Task: structure prediction
Amino acid sequence: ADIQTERAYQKQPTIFQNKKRVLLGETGKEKLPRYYKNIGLGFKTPKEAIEGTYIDKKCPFTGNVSIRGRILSGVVTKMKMQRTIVIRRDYLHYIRKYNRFEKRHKNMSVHLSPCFRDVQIGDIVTVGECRPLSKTVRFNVLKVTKAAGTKKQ
Amino acid sequence: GRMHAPGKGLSQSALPYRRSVPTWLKLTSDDVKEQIYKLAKKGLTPSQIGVILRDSHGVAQVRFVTGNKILRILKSKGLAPDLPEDLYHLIKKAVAVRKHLERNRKDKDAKFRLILIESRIHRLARYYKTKRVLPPNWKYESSTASALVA
Amino acid sequence: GKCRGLRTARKLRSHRRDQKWHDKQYKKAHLGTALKANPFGGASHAKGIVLEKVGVEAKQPNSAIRKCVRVQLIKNGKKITAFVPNDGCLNFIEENDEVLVAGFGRKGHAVGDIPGVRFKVVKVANVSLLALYKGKKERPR
Amino acid sequence: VRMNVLADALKSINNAEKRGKRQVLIRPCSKVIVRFLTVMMKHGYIGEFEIIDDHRAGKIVVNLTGRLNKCGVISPRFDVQLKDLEKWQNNLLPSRQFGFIVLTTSAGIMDHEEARRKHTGGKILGFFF
RNA sequence: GGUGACCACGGGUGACGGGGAAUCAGGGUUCGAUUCCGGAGAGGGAGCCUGAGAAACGGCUACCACAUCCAAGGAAGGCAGCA
RNA sequence: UAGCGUAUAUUAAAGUUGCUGCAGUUAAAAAGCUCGUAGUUGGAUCUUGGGAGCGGGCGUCCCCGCCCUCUCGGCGGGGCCCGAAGCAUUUACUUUGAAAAAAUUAGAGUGUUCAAAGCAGGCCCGAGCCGCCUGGAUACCGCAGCUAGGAAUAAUGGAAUAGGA
RNA sequence: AGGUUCGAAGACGAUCAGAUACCGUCGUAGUUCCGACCAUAAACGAUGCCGACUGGCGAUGCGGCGGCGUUAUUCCCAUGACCCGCCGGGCAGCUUCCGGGAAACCAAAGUCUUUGGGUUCCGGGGGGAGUAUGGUUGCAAAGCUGAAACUUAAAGGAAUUGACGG
RNA sequence: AGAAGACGGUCGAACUUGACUAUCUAGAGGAAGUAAAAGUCGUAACAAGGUUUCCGUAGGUGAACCUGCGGAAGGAUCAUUA
Ligand SMILES: [Mg+2]
Ligand SMILES: [Mg+2]
Ligand SMILES: [Mg+2]
Ligand SMILES: [Mg+2]
Ligand SMILES: [Mg+2]
Ligand SMILES: [Mg+2]
Ligand SMILES: [Mg+2]
Ligand SMILES: [Mg+2]
Ligand SMILES: [Mg+2]
Ligand SMILES: [Mg+2]
Ligand SMILES: [Mg+2]
Ligand SMILES: [Mg+2]
Ligand SMILES: [Mg+2]
Ligand SMILES: [Mg+2]
Ligand SMILES: [Mg+2]
Ligand SMILES: [Mg+2]
Ligand SMILES: [Mg+2]
Result:
């Protein structure tokens, strides 16, 4: 519900909240300033990252990761394991002797920031390489594309 | 050949080349739609509506007269059936076989045929699931199917 | 028939190796039972010590006594039977001599009318058997 | 159940040519079939042909000339680079003097001499000689 | 939670990897301990000092296995470097 | 022939492992039969002839140029102009360009006395000649990754409770 | 549950050198029904399934269409029985230098060095051996999966000529 | 400024014990397969092989095998008449 659900106070490290709030200000409404950055490579910052209130230190827009290296794509298959999803990347492997292909796949775990709210199984995501964020996570979700949906019953 | 039979039968309809409405058909599009609405409110399936309109009204194809098909007309009017009609008939046949089979337990032929009918049901339901005609959680349950049909 | 699809390389390759296990030579070379069973252990020759001089009766329709020796190898001390080829070469070999032993030609298969013998003697104690037969050298006495 | 219309078209052409017949009816039609036949007809191996329009897939009535030996298809459309075209020429064609390999390239459907002329590769459709 | 018939996990290898080598229509099948590059080890395991850099062995400490000298109290070892 | 025999591993022979490319009535070999999920494969259909000058001869052949978009053009508002941004799907495919150690292999040059090699060498001296010329190329380097053209083939996507342009 | 008839086992009579057989007489389990197991057959067309193309002929079974006449009720139109054809899907047959095949043969076993429509299962000289062992299913009998050591130069197929045939 | 030493922690060799696992190996006795056969007993199969053969299953018997119930022709019949 609220964002302070941990044992330690959750805050963006580069925002000073206690900026001498005195009688000349309104009580309220006050809204504490939000740190966000523009990652390069022509990727738009989602508006939910602009005026959201989540704290995520591994978010590419409001956190302390920097995207560099490889930009890949895949299809969401699991959405357990909080703030992290499993995507599947299918590809064809060429075998020279029979001069045909075979179908292979690899899973990678990627960090899904809470600026992407309506993410479902079967969606196509764009991921960017960052520094190691955990034992197995090295990529971070940059853009979510819906697949054959947008209309429900 | 057939999906679940060893038949190579060749019998079907042969639509003619000319798609134009014949000059003798003194029926415009909207009153043909009204006949469709009357028959559908009487409780008929689109196959039966087409059969009646062909047999005793001169409408050989409503797609050439109205411009679209019977189920599209019923859906636009908001009175298309909730299940697709072929899935409905397959479930009806499955229920009939299952009731007969529970009163006659030594009919192994009916057991074999019920396996075939339910396989066809599941293939059809998978197709309708991919095309969003059925809900994604839809599932042919044998125990509650009879309350859905007939 | 076989599958010809563009994405069928896994099926083709898996089938080929599963079916490669069905010929005698591939299985003999790649299973390891044959390598463990043969006394030479993958070597081409071996050294051993003569235990006794035997004569094996030739297979029908031939009729002779083929002069062999019973040899116990120095490594892995199995006991084999080795042919002693030529007209008088058995008289060169004395009991408890130390011979070299080669294959007899058909890669672990018996040869000729000699039943069950896969080995022949080359170089009874270190002077070679051909030089002894041809008079080139003599026993180191 | 009929995975390849070009395969069945070329098999029908081949069988009726071997029987000595003068015309062939090719039952399902497609534009790959028409482009293949246009290559074959520009090179002089078949005669005129006529497409019959019913509102389903059409039919083609091909006039044969007696100049055809074999017009088979290659069953997966293997992707062929210009380096590997010589290998396919040796495997498929009876000589270096006559016979053509029909490729589909991004420049169109064409024989292998034209494909080497225009410096392009593609997927192999079939051969005829 | 994660992984798996698109073969995970486990077992074997007479498996160091690669550049390459033999064979020789086109395909392919075998081989690569071996002078170049990368790795690993210094009888077996373990732990350290010094230093920019070592978990070093032509450094040290300990145990295990071998093993040398001794006046029997002790002391000294490590060729998968060249011979 | 200064060499030749033998044993064993391995390659061709072997289209006797078959992708190219084998077989399965009777030689060895089709499951007793049907359903079925992964896997593999999947009908036809959406731009083509007249088009713009060079154009294999408008010579009824055609090097070939096709007769993508717009906000600052930077050679708040003049023709001489072209760049900042993006692609009206995304891929596979194909062609190109960068990058893929050297050695080895292919291959250019060079009379090691020939050759296997090597990377060297060659030209005038009537002698000052207080030395001149030239090399040490090039190709290939699977798949994966990067890049720029094509867009046939194959996959895929957009307006149906209109939540459309 | 039921057990008429047949009839593994068994008994006897014959035949025979022997006769635990063939022949004869009797006869248990079984054969029959209900309920539950087992999953094997020369379970065969010794020929995977789906699709396309490539000769002729006469029949046959089902459905449909069209025609001189005969026949039934009934006097007519139907509707049946027959007769002459056409179309579709079947079980087959004859014939053919289509083509194939080692041939026998096969209109599929053809459209294959002029080799690529899609796909599943499966063979790799003969034996050892469908054995050993492990696993797994079954009440059992057994089924499924399944080696190796060792041994061997042929084992086979189809045709030809002889010889032999109670 | 500080050496020996000590409580605790942490890496952790090694030893003892137990389990599991892989390979190799002894064994009274039993039951096979190959051979070398040139022994004994019969004659199951190949001809209608002297009871046509073979498959599955079950029982029995010195041995090959026999018999029962279904099946096949790979049979000794592509055929038997209104
Ligand atoms: Mg086929
Ligand atoms: Mg090793
Ligand atoms: Mg190496
Ligand atoms: Mg090194
Ligand atoms: Mg080290
Ligand atoms: Mg050390
Ligand atoms: Mg070979
Ligand atoms: Mg073969
Ligand atoms: Mg057979
Ligand atoms: Mg499936
Ligand atoms: Mg298509
Ligand atoms: Mg009786
Ligand atoms: Mg019974
Ligand atoms: Mg075999
Ligand atoms: Mg008998
Ligand atoms: Mg007999
Ligand atoms: Mg008999």
